[PDB]
Amino acid sequence: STTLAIVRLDPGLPLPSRAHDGDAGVDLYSAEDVELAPGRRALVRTGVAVAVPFGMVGLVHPRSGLATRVGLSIVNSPGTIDAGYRGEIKVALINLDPAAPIVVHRGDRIAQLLVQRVELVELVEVSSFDE
Amino acid sequence: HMSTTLAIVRLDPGLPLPSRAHDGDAGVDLYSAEDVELAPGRRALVRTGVAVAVPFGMVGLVHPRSGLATRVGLSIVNSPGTIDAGYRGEIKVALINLDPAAPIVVHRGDRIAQLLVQRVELVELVEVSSFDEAGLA
Amino acid sequence: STTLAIVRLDPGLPLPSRAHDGDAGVDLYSAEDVELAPGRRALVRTGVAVAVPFGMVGLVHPRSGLATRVGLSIVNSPGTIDAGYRGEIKVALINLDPAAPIVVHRGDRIAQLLVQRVELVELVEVSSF
Numbered sequence: 001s002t003t004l005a006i007v008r009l010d011p012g013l014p015l016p017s018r019a020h021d022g023d024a025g026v027d028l029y030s031a032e033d034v035e036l037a038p039g040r041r042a043l044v045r046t047g048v049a050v051a052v053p054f055g056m057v058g059l060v061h062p063r064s065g066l067a068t069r070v071g072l073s074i075v076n077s078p079g080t081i082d083a084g085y086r087g088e089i090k091v092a093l094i095n096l097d098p099a100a101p102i103v104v105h106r107g108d109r110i111a112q113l114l115v116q117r118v119e120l121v122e123l124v125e126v127s128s129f130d131e
Numbered sequence: 132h133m134s135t136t137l138a139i140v141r142l143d144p145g146l147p148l149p150s151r152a153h154d155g156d157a158g159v160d161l162y163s164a165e166d167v168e169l170a171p172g173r174r175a176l177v178r179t180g181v182a183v184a185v186p187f188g189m190v191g192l193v194h195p196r197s198g199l200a201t202r203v204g205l206s207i208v209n210s211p212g213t214i215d216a217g218y219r220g221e222i223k224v225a226l227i228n229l230d231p232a233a234p235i236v237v238h239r240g241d242r243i244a245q246l247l248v249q250r251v252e253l254v255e256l257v258e259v260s261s262f263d264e265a266g267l268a
Numbered sequence: 269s270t271t272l273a274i275v276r277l278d279p280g281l282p283l284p285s286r287a288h289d290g291d292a293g294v295d296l297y298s299a300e301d302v303e304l305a306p307g308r309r310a311l312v313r314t315g316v317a318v319a320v321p322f323g324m325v326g327l328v329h330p331r332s333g334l335a336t337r338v339g340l341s342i343v344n345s346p347g348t349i350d351a352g353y354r355g356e357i358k359v360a361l362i363n364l365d366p367a368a369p370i371v372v373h374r375g376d377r378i379a380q381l382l383v384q385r386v387e388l389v390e391l392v393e394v395s396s397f
């Protein structure tokens with residue numbers, strides 16, 4: 001029941017929002033219009049930056065509707081947004097369809113952002129495991 | 132440690148009930164209610180014959196099965212599939228054959244993916260003019 | 269503060285480490301050299317095995333740099349490391365670029381590992397919703 005500081009690098013876009021209570025993420029908009037040819041990819045700017053709390057992590061997930069209907073996916077899915085990252089959030093989209101192209105319009109919801117805690121583990125090297 | 136329960140409805144009473152192979156196993160395997168064949172590069176939305184009630188504050192995640200991933204190149208377009216807490220519909224998996232030549236034959240009753248459940252920070256967005264001005268440089 | 273036991277099966281690679289305080293994961297290296305032609309995949313060794321605490325889960329995430337740059341992805345992303353597992357972590361790399369083959373050399377960072385709690389939920393069958 002955390003707050004996430006967000007800066008709208010592109011004031012021309014709506015502020016990402018949680019569709020329904022409980023909804024895992026908030027949809028991210030595309031700041032640009034782009035066409036992905038079958039098999040081709042693209043790094044798309046979302047017009048936003050966020051400040052994920054220390055001990056937490058941002059996760060860029062693909063939208064299931066578009067995923068099925070047009071084969072639109074994310075190459076590095078899940079996208080990993082570190083707590084210290086202050087740059088702009090970009091989504092590496094890819095058209096996984098075999099023959100049809102994917103049209104992306106400035107203003108479309110091209111991904112969803114989730115926020116979860118993360119175990120900042122201290123790795124301790126051992127000679128072997130206990131059995 | 133001691134968690135909660137997850138209410139599950141077998142929409143298709145012909146498939147087994149998903150379960151946790153081992154105690155510490157992150158998730159439970161989901162079965163395919165249908166027979167499907169994925170030609171190379173082709174995809175499909177396959178039904179799992181189940182619906183769930185992910186508790187408020189938690190999310191359901193649909194991950195691929197490493198085995199089939201390596202052996203035949205089976206993947207899931209929207210991995211990780213996000214199952215929202217308020218969703219009460221049937222879980223479906225967007226299976227895709229990432230292999231270059233060999234089709235992939237899916238049989239009703241096969242384990243096609245696994246489902247994990249985690250808590251999820253239901254963050255409240257707070258727009259700020261800039262990180263510097265907000266003291267977040 | 270949670271600690272993660274880890275064995276460098278291949279003593280010739282650096283121990284995986286967290287780039288910055290706050291960074292979600294730690295980059296896992298490649299223990300071998302591999303070239304993936306377009307559309308081709310390969311299960312790569314990392315030269316390490318870990319011991320995910322009971323109640324937690326490991327997760328293998330692709331690195332965004334290479335994904336955008338050369339189209340390098342992970343077939344089963346996110347890779348699930350169960351608490352029970354004690355074998356070598358292997359990554360299922362795949363070349364999603366149309367024409368350019370991908371070259372990986374021993375010592376490269378091919379993936380990042382995350383650890384998170386997981387709800388070991390108890391399934392209960394019910395009649396309806």
Ligand SMILES: O=c1ccn([C@H]2CC(O)[C@@H](COP(=O)(O)OP(=O)(O)OP(=O)(O)O)O2)c(=O)[nH]1
Nearest residue numbers: 063064065066193212213214215218221222223
């Ligand atoms: O592997 C999946 C992913 C999603 N769903 C369902 C359940 C759920 O929460 C809803 C929507 O998924 P999502 O929010 O990812 O995709 P969307 O394209 O953004 O659609 P929606 O507009 O309904 O939010 O779709 C599944 O059955 N299986």
Ligand SMILES: O=c1ccn([C@H]2CC(O)[C@@H](COP(=O)(O)OP(=O)(O)OP(=O)(O)O)O2)c(=O)[nH]1
Nearest residue numbers: 060079080081082085088089090091331332333
């Ligand atoms: O979909 C994404 C993925 C990552 N990032 C940013 C935020 C963040 O945490 C940082 C690095 O992501 P990552 O660790 O995946 O890529 P990398 O290639 O491993 O590089 P690095 O950690 O070296 O900066 O890059 C995005 O804006 N969008």
Ligand SMILES: O=c1ccn([C@H]2CC(O)[C@@H](COP(=O)(O)OP(=O)(O)OP(=O)(O)O)O2)c(=O)[nH]1
Nearest residue numbers: 196197198199328347348349350353356357358
């Ligand atoms: O990116 C990955 C994913 C899995 N593994 C290993 C570790 C681990 O837990 C085991 C396989 O568990 P998993 O649920 O992924 O595979 P499965 O296909 O569902 O099969 P099962 O539990 O029968 O093995 O494989 C990796 O090394 N890398």
Ligand SMILES: [Cr+3]
Nearest residue numbers: 019023112215
């Ligand atoms: Cr939604």
Ligand SMILES: [Cr+3]
Nearest residue numbers: 152156160245
């Ligand atoms: Cr398993």
Ligand SMILES: [Cr+3]
Nearest residue numbers: 287291295380
């Ligand atoms: Cr990093």
